[PDB]
Structures are given as C-alpha cells and as structure tokens.
Write an enzyme that holds these catalytic residues in place. Structure first.
Site, short mmCIF file in Angstrom:
data_model
loop_
_atom_site.label_atom_id
_atom_site.label_comp_id
_atom_site.label_asym_id
_atom_site.label_seq_id
_atom_site.Cartn_x
_atom_site.Cartn_y
_atom_site.Cartn_z
N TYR A 143 0.83 -1.22 0.00
CA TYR A 143 0.00 0.00 0.00
C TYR A 143 0.87 1.26 0.00
CZ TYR A 143 -3.09 3.65 2.07
OH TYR A 143 -3.80 4.80 2.33
N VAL A 186 -9.22 1.54 13.86
CA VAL A 186 -9.33 1.30 15.32
C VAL A 186 -10.47 2.10 15.98
CG1 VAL A 186 -7.64 3.06 16.15
CG2 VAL A 186 -7.98 0.91 17.43
N1 LIG Z 1 -7.27 6.89 7.78
C1 LIG Z 1 -7.71 6.82 6.54
O1 LIG Z 1 -9.04 6.43 6.28
C2 LIG Z 1 -6.78 7.17 5.42
C3 LIG Z 1 -5.50 7.65 5.69
C4 LIG Z 1 -4.65 8.05 4.66
C5 LIG Z 1 -5.10 7.98 3.34
N2 LIG Z 1 -6.36 7.52 3.07
C6 LIG Z 1 -6.78 7.47 1.65
O2 LIG Z 1 -7.98 8.18 1.47
C7 LIG Z 1 -8.72 7.64 0.39
C8 LIG Z 1 -10.13 7.28 0.88
O3 LIG Z 1 -10.02 6.34 1.94
P1 LIG Z 1 -11.29 5.89 2.81
O4 LIG Z 1 -10.79 5.71 4.18
O5 LIG Z 1 -12.43 6.77 2.53
O6 LIG Z 1 -11.60 4.39 2.28
P2 LIG Z 1 -12.89 3.87 1.51
O7 LIG Z 1 -12.69 2.43 1.22
O8 LIG Z 1 -14.12 4.19 2.25
O9 LIG Z 1 -12.96 4.74 0.13
C9 LIG Z 1 -12.34 4.31 -1.07
C10 LIG Z 1 -13.41 4.27 -2.16
O10 LIG Z 1 -12.83 3.85 -3.38
C11 LIG Z 1 -13.72 2.93 -4.01
N3 LIG Z 1 -12.89 2.03 -4.82
C12 LIG Z 1 -12.01 1.07 -4.38
N4 LIG Z 1 -11.43 0.52 -5.48
C13 LIG Z 1 -11.95 1.10 -6.58
C14 LIG Z 1 -11.73 0.89 -7.94
N5 LIG Z 1 -10.89 -0.06 -8.36
N6 LIG Z 1 -12.43 1.67 -8.85
C15 LIG Z 1 -13.33 2.63 -8.43
N7 LIG Z 1 -13.53 2.81 -7.08
C16 LIG Z 1 -12.85 2.05 -6.18
C17 LIG Z 1 -14.38 2.20 -2.84
O11 LIG Z 1 -15.61 1.58 -3.14
C18 LIG Z 1 -14.54 3.29 -1.82
O12 LIG Z 1 -15.81 3.90 -1.93
C19 LIG Z 1 -7.96 6.40 -0.06
O13 LIG Z 1 -7.14 6.73 -1.17
C20 LIG Z 1 -7.08 6.07 1.12
O14 LIG Z 1 -5.93 5.34 0.75
C21 LIG Z 1 -7.21 7.11 4.08
#
Ligand SMILES: NC(=O)c1ccc[n+]([C@@H]2O[C@H](COP(=O)([O-])OP(=O)(O)OC[C@H]3O[C@@H](n4cnc5c(N)ncnc54)[C@H](O)[C@@H]3O)[C@@H](O)[C@H]2O)c1
Length: 311
Positions: A143, A186
């Site tokens: 990742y 968490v």
């Molecule tokens: N603490 C955190 O939640 C955190 C921290 C750092 C970065 N991020 C980043 O923020 C972004 C959103 O994360 P999140 O926590 O909302 O997770 P999440 O899983 O709720 O959101 C990701 C979305 O992308 C969609 N998705 C996944 N694969 C796909 C694909 N192949 N094609 C089209 N859509 C797809 C999913 O259905 C989902 O709705 C991500 O890029 C994640 O890596 C999150």
C-alpha cells in the site's frame, strides 16, 4: 468547476462530495462500490459505477460528465489487505490510477487532487518530531509503495505533460461512515465493541499494558475542508494532520467517555510491523489558513453517535 470524485461513495470521499456541493460546485462520483455505499452519494449527483481498472468505463465517465478537476480518493485502502494481496493493491492504486491520469491528459483536466498517506509514507517519526513534506518516502507495505509510486507519477505527469496536482498526505482519518479497515480503523473497532459491551484488544506499543501506538488522528470533516482548499489553490505535497499525537489508550478513553461505558480492556503484545509513532507536521497547510475545527474529544463523540445511530 466540475469535479469528478473517484471513491466518492466511500468514507472520506462522501464527506468531500458534500463539502464541494456546499461550495456551488458541480460534482460527480466514480466508484465501483468495493467498499463504498450507493447511499453515501446524495440525490442528483451523477454516479458512475465504474472500476478505475476498466479504461473504457473511465473514458465513459469523462465523456458524460466532462470534469474540469479530479479528486482521486478511490483506492485499495487497507494496509493489511495490501500485504496479503499486493497485486490487488497495485492494480487499483497504480494501474487504476494511471488510467485516471491518462483520461486527465485526454480531457485537459486542470488539477488532480490525490488522497495520499502520511502514516504509510514517512515511516517512524522520532519522539518530539513531526514528519515534514520534504522527508523521503520510506514505504514498508505494498500500500505504501503504490501510494509513493503514484506520487512519482503525479510529479512526472506534472513535469512532462503540465497536469497540475496536489498530494494530500492524510493522517489517521476518523469519523462518521468509516469502516474498520482504513488507517484509523481502530476508531470504528473500539466504537462498535465498546457500544456492544465486547472486550477490546489494546495492542502494546512495546510492552503489553503500555499506552499503545501514537498516531495523528484527524477528523474527516477537517480533511474535507483541507481538500477544498487544495482543490481551489494548492499544488505539490501537503500533510493533512493535526500535528498532535494520541495513543491507542487515549482513543479508547475518548470512545468510552462518549459511549458512557466502562469497557473491558485486554492487553496484547505489539502487532508485528506496526509503527510505534507517526505525527505529521501541519505547518505547510496551516500557513494557507487551514486548521482543524473539530477537536479530538468532539470528533470521537461525533463518531460514536454515528455508530449508536444505526438500527
Ligand atoms: N485513515 C484513513 O481512512 C486514510 C489515511 C490516509 C489515506 N487515506 C486514503 O484516502 C482515500 C479514501 O479512503 P477511505 O478511508 O475513505 O476508504 P474507503 O474504502 O471508504 O474509500 C475508497 C473508495 O474507493 C472505491 N474504490 C475502491 N477501489 C476502486 C476501484 N478499483 N475503482 C473505483 N472505485 C474504487 C471504494 O468503493 C470506496 O468507496 C484512499 O485513497 C485512502 O488510501 C485514508
């Protein structure tokens, strides 16, 4: 401005969509619903149920919506999943990411705002210190590698093709609508289990019974605000964190307070290959006027209420 939000049916993505709609923007969502929910997309928002790995579907969304700006939140967003399934993480984060960049070039998109990760990119942050945007990536998981790699692609696409970009390195983002799988999973685990009266596992930082690992917890509403600022006015790399750490014990105490329950805590040894400490330097973003509006206790309260409010 016409903003296409990939992953807009997800946790952070849905908060971004609502934030942008409240700023007079035309907004669309592209999401394959791997983890996102159709119900997270407001009425009247064009929704493209498309996998970023499907080039023809991405092309269709661009043709139908004609975005001026792209917010790229879609990802395989579980560190755990990436270690057990590096190919899925690669296909979604890099291959899907590249299909998106190619559509951006073709359609003359004016800016791409990327959801990156401070936790997974910087590695261990020494005591007293805060990870700054010039620190070199130190990815440990697939990742982290795919996110770091995608940032290299953004930089080369900017240099070669003139695509303007911003990479927002989010801290541990928590709040209503989150699942237990993301970097601040968490919070959902504790909220659900404390509310149900189930024992919770408190993983040690080094010694079972200690305070646990330290992270920069940032409320999702504050992330959505930073995202709007980035979209309107920023380029390059920006941390999105509070600049203060909280231990796992502190998260549990806040969840217990908000739930008004006294949870049964079971200590466990450190989880292997977990960082002891990550805190982000917020200075670069804060110089442009951004600050968290929601404090840690308040944010945890709002998250707990959301988990209480299901039927
Ligand atoms: N603490 C955190 O939640 C955190 C921290 C750092 C970065 N991020 C980043 O923020 C972004 C959103 O994360 P999140 O926590 O909302 O997770 P999440 O899983 O709720 O959101 C990701 C979305 O992308 C969609 N998705 C996944 N694969 C796909 C694909 N192949 N094609 C089209 N859509 C797809 C999913 O259905 C989902 O709705 C991500 O890029 C994640 O890596 C999150």
């Amino acid at each position: 401005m016409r903003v296409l939000v990939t992953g807009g049916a997800g946790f952070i993505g849905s908060h971004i969509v609502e934030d942008l709609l409240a700023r007079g923007l035309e907004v669309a969502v592209l999401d394959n619903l791997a983890t996102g929910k159709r119900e997270n997309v407001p009425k009247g928002v064009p929704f493209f149920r498309v996998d970023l790995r499907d080039k023809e579907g991405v092309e269709r969304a661009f043709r139908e919506f004609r975005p001026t700006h792209v917010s790229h939140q879609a990802a395989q967003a579980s560190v755990k999943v990436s270690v057990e399934d590096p190919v899925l993480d690669f296909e979604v984060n890099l291959l899907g990411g590249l299909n998106l960049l190619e559509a951006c070039r073709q359609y003359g998109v004016e800016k791409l705002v990327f959801a990156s990760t401070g936790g997974a990119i910087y590695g261990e942050v020494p005591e007293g210190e805060r990870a700054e945007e010039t620190w070199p990536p130190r990815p440990k998981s697939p990742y982290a590698a795919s996110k770091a790699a995608f940032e290299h692609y953004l930089s080369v696409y900017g240099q070669s093709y003139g695509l303007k970009w911003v990479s927002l390195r989010y801290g541990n983002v928590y709040g209503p609508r989150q699942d237990p799988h993301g970097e601040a999973g968490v919070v959902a685990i504790f909220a659900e289990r404390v509310l149900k009266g189930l024992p919770v596992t408190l993983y040690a930082r080094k010694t079972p019974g200690d305070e646990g690992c330290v992270r920069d917890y940032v409320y999702v509403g504050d992330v959505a605000e930073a995202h709007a600022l980035a979209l309107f006015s920023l380029e390059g790399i920006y941390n999105v964190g509070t600049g203060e750490g909280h231990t796992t014990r502190e998260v549990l105490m806040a969840v217990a307070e908000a739930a008004g329950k006294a949870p049964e805590v079971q200590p466990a040894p450190p989880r292997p290959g977990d960082l002891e400490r990550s805190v982000l330097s917020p200075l670069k973003l804060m110089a442009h006027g951004w600050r968290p509006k929601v404090g840690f206790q308040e944010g945890i309260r709002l998250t707990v209420d959301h988990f209480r409010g299901a039927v």
